[model samples]
Target: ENFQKVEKIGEGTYGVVYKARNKLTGEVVALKKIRPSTAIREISLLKELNHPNIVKLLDVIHTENKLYLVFEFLHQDLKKFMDASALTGIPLPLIKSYLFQLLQGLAFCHSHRVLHRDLKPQNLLINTEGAIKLADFGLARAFGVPVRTYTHEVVTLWYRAPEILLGCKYYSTAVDIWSLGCIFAEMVTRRALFPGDSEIDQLFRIFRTLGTPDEVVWPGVTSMPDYKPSFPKWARQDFSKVVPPLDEDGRSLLSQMLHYDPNKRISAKAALAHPFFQDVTKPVPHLRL
Candidate 1:
């Protein structure tokens, strides 16, 4: 082993990440040991990506049963950052900076036809300098309409889009935008907007917050394969009640992002242009990792 394994940083269904150091250079790095089969999708796509907002894969080490993916180390993630700053609370400008980089990263990924199906706060990495980098492509895949059908079990429950929950086999980058909206709300309030324990609960939570959708607001809503005629109707609450710290523009962008119809959801590129990110586009901090 060329690297001295220091400690385990994270673990999930796919694999484990370690905080390791090079024995020769004394440089610290994230050593993710994943099965070769597990690396097929994420690694190949990762190799194709080259953007400042995305994490860099430095090198790969082949072993008997496991493949080690070497990546540059980042000290913090958004969740931990939020926990630490709970007392003083985060500022609007900082939230703007993070959201801007997030949209920028998503826009770049969508441009390349890649869909980051899972985009919770834990997957968003933050460096000490306040730069945000999108990480963990384990659940990501390339998406092209009518060309392929994706599994509905991909994204985590809370961040999953309504179309996917309603059993839409074919989806686009709109799925990720829904997750973006949930994450943005979480950043503002320091809690998940909809913490559902199951898929049904997830859908109801969404409906209760945004009101029950019908064919009028969401065309073909009743035509979806999973739509239920008896689904309860609830009134939409003012977004300020959900994200109190967000300004009017931010609230508008979030609403557009979390729309029930995937076709109606805002694209990441368009989200970047929203007035909510105006200050972020100017004098932005360097995000190169």
Candidate 2:
């Protein structure tokens, strides 16, 4: 499975990723070489995942100085698609296709009991025909059954679930849902959805839209670590201005995904049956191979 280095794609805490093509099979692949700086944890995590929505880990080889990871190739990423001039005002149907694929993949990950802690746009890859695949599971960890509190340091703050932002150490797949909702919003608007500059802004932004989580909506929210935020405490606000372009069904789905309570949040699998996807008008199936 030898491959020649093509070009560097992005840098990571544990390794550098490169675009490469295998000589024998003629298959293009992303070769991720482990860096000395990160903990030696990639191999163990890679072995736990088996799903089509996620990037496939093909082969791993260890040489004198580092470890190598060969992954399925992808052309561009969700972030790039959102930024492209051709996709600046992407049709709702196309955006629905991307969102549906993302949910399908996340559903599998959650079912396998893996939480993609870093569920950011750059970590999502779009193939030549527009298949959305989740990539860069370097930070993913398998949750033990019966559940317990985990370290709060997970998922980028911008897309972080409100429960996590409220400092709930014991988070589940709901964090990824929040991130997915943010991705849906960004895809529709071609802009970031939250965390304008800092953690404070992110929380305020969320509160302004869905309204603050009260004890009724999310019990024990105030007791979480760092609960007090910087801005004034205002009553929950309507979501009309928050998500303007999204249709009613789309708005409702986004609301469910971005729900403040992890327990009350919509599961990725259930999200697959949403009405927004009914008229997605695309040829792809929801559950990928």
TM-score winner:
1
How well is each residue in 92-155 modelled by candidate 2, as lDDT tens digits?
Answer: 7778877888888888878877787768887888765657889865454422211111222233
User: Residue 244 deviation, candidate 2, in Å?
Assistant: 1.4
Using lDDT, give the best candidate's number.
Answer: 1
> Cα miss at 222, model 1 (Å)?
2.1
lDDT of 1: 0.78
List runs of model 2 lying over 4 Å from the truth: 36-42, 86-88, 142-156, 229-231, 283-289
lDDT of 2: 0.73
lDDT of 2 at 178: 87
User: Cα deviation in Å at residue 61, candidate 1?
Assistant: 4.1
Q: After aligning candidate 2 to the native by TM-score, how far in Å is the CA of 143 from where it should be? A: 14
Write down the worst ten-residue block by lDDT for model 2: 143-152
lDDT of each: 0.78, 0.73
Q: After superposition, how far is residue 125 of candidate 2 from its true place, in Å?
A: 0.9
